[PDB]
Symmetry: C2
Subunit: 240 residues, 2 copies
């Protein structure tokens, strides 16, 4: 209950995984998205704690393409998006789920969550937290590891915001989501041509909240829309 209260204090609109998948699949079914004709894609952190969300959508839409990497950025990039587009069922569409993530503990502390078989869970999101430390310290001072370098690069503009935050562990996944949303939008704008005529791309973006094992995880929806083959938005389902 302390955890759940903390979740809803920071994010009053947060949905359980079950609520999210039910809502998204119900809405998209009105627009012709079904199992046979939808290709699922995710851009979520490589951390094992993010797997339940992929599994919950995969029960609906089947095996998914991954475009993510550390902290959930779409490191698959243009080539990854094109690979995905090239696998969409004929006359069908893609559903992309992306976001940052953050752990919240049994005592409602953000930025950490208990991990299986460990007494100390450590940071969640680990990549984002390490990156935030590096960019804020450098700010306050007024391919072997290329991904983590990119995470620092994309987090650098938020250094002031992070340093001034009341709770940096809540502000961090919001900033990471903002950086992701920009990059995803750029990729979709560039790889627009790869979607065939009638085909669409539905997008769900937000913040994944990883809770202790006895609890459902949660998701904060910040983007839920459909774009056409020409890169144009044709439906916006926000706000919920």
């Amino acid at each position: 209950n302390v955890t759940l209260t903390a979740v809803k204090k920071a994010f009053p609109d947060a949905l359980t995984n079950a609520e999210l998948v039910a809502m998204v699949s119900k809405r998209l079914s009105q627009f012709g998205y079904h199992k046979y004709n939808t290709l699922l894609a995710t851009s979520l952190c490589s951390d094992e704690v993010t797997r339940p969300l992929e599994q919950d959508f995969g029960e609906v839409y089947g095996k998914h393409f991954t475009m993510g990497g550390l902290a959930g950025f779409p490191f698959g990039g243009l080539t990854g998006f094109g690979a995905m587009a090239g696998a969409i069922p004929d006359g069908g569409s893609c559903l992309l789920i992306y976001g940052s993530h953050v752990g919240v503990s049994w005592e409602g502390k953000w930025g950490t969550v208990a991990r299986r078989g460990r007494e100390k869970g450590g940071a969640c999101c680990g990549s984002a937290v390490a990156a935030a430390q590096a960019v804020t310290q450098a700010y306050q001072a007024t391919p072997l590891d290329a991904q983590q370098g990119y995470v620092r690069d994309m987090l650098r503009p938020y250094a002031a915001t992070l340093s001034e935050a009341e709770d940096v562990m809540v502000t961090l996944p919001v900033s990471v989501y903002d950086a992701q949303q920009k990059l995803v939008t750029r990729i979709l704008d560039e790889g627009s041509n790869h979607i065939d005529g009638d085909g669409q791309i539905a997008v769900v973006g937000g913040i994944q909240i990883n809770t202790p094992k006895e609890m459902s995880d949660f998701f904060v929806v910040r983007r839920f829309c459909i774009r056409d083959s020409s890169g144009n938005m044709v439906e916006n389902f926000m706000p919920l």
Copy 2:
């Protein structure tokens, strides 16, 4: 059948996914790898067709960390490896599954495989095939997309091999695996520190063979070994 003949012709030692998981789990159980104390990690291509292998090992060892990206290279890098190591159950170990992959069609043609809801399946591995084309064409003339650039980079040493190949589609996954094995070894040598004392890293590396839907997928084991927290190889299970 035609597909199975092609598979065994080029890869006599290929195992079905079921055979692979049975063999690996049986062997590692003799070395104390069980569900409660093992953290599963993969470095496989972002392509949706590679998911069954993750699911099959996931049934035994649970939710996995991902390290992969385009063509299955360990793009998570040092930070990704450290993130994984920091989540290993106390006193437990990691199991890393990595590999290239390749499609084989109902007609026994390499480098392609039928995809759900599609008349044309396109390349498999798409990323590797595109990279191969680029580096062999360049040879024969004697963040937005950084991963594919890295794939081209790591395949460049193999340009002569690929251009001389009798069937480049059957040679390509072997070259990709060779490039992967070097990078994985480098990451494990660097991030050895992150494993604590008694903890080990078990490694399975090879070539994932993606077959038509009515058929089992296969895997060609090229590496199956155990390393200790100091980076030393303590067991080598090859050849099977």
